[PDB]
């Protein structure tokens, strides 16, 4: 499992933060695909989230002007936290707390989301938002299919490569 990156330098957030949030996201999703994340239910077809610098740039607009991402029909998650130590360990913790927010986790874990980007700002407090390309609906079921081993096991989107039992597409347009 490693970060899969799409496009350029709307990626302003430093590697270790970016990789911490990405590994948290795709780490969970991978366990849920394998049906082995406690509390999340039966194995299923899961797309990995491609880290998208464009979507990180939208996340940054979203912090600057709340409501922005919804205008573009995006999923959004938010996580914050006061802290005092290293900004990097604070974030590690904030995510753990964030993982106990059942509403937020619905977006994090949505099998038909295929890309995301997050941005954060320091005020000592940190605020992060993530933008996702597909937002689940309330009551929408997440179960279905099976965890990919070969590319053919990916049904949701057309041009998908299976890797680490996660399906990846770069064209879910
Ligand atoms: Mn392969």
Main attributes?
Pathogenesis-related Protein, globular, 173 residues, CAP, unknown function, alpha/beta, 5 helices, SCP/taps, monomeric, binds manganese (II) ion
Describe the structure.
It contains 5 helices and 7 strands. It has 173 residues and is an alpha/beta fold. It has a single domain, classed as 3-Layer(aba) Sandwich (Pathogenesis-related Protein p14a), CATH 3.40.33. Helix 1 packs parallel to helix 4. The strands form 2 sheets. A 5-stranded mixed β-sheet has the order 1-2-4-5-3. Helices cover 32% and strands 20% of the residues. Manganese (II) ion binds next to strand 6.
Kindly report how far apart the N and C termini lie.
24 Å
Q: Any idea what the radius of gyration is? A: 15 Å
The CATH topology name reads: Pathogenesis-related Protein p14a
Number of domains: 1
CATH superfamily, called what? Answer: CAP
User: If strands are numbered along the chain, what order do they take across the biggest sheet?
Assistant: 1-2-4-5-3
Written as H for each helix and E for each strand, in order along the chain, the element string is EHEHHEHHEEEE
Strand content range: 15-25%
Catalogue the ligands.
manganese (II) ion
Give the total of beta strands: 7
CATH architecture: 3-Layer(aba) Sandwich
Number of H- or I-type helical stretches: 5
Summing up helix and strand content along with how strands pair, one would put the structural category as alpha/beta
The general outline is globular
Largest sheet: 5 strands, mixed
Helix content: 25-40%
For the record, the CATH class is Alpha Beta
PDB class: unknown function
Keywords: Pathogenesis-related Protein, CAP, SCP/taps
Assembly: monomeric
Entry title: Manganese-bound Ac-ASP-7
């Amino acid at each position: 499992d490693i970060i899969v990156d799409n496009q350029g330098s709307g990626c302003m957030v430093d590697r270790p933060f970016r990789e911490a949030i990405d590994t948290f996201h795709n780490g969970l999703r991978q366990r849920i695909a394998k049906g082995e994340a406690e509390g999340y239910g039966p194995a299923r077809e899961m797309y990995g989230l491609v880290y998208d610098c464009g979507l990180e740039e939208e996340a940054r607009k979203e912090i600057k002007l709340p409501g922005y991402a919804d205008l573009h029909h995006r999923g959004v998650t938010r996580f914050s936290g006061d802290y005092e130590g290293s900004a990097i360990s604070a974030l590690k913790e904030i995510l753990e707390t964030f993982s106990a927010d059942k509403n937020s986790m619905r977006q994090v874990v949505y099998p038909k989301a295929t890309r995301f980007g997050c941005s954060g700002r320091l005020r000592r407090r940190m605020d992060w938002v993530c933008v996702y390309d597909k937002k689940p609906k309330d009551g929408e079921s997440f179960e279905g299919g099976k965890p990919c081993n070969e590319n053919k096991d990916c049904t949701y989107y057309k041009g998908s490569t299976c890797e680490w039992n996660l399906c990846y597409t770069f064209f879910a347009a």
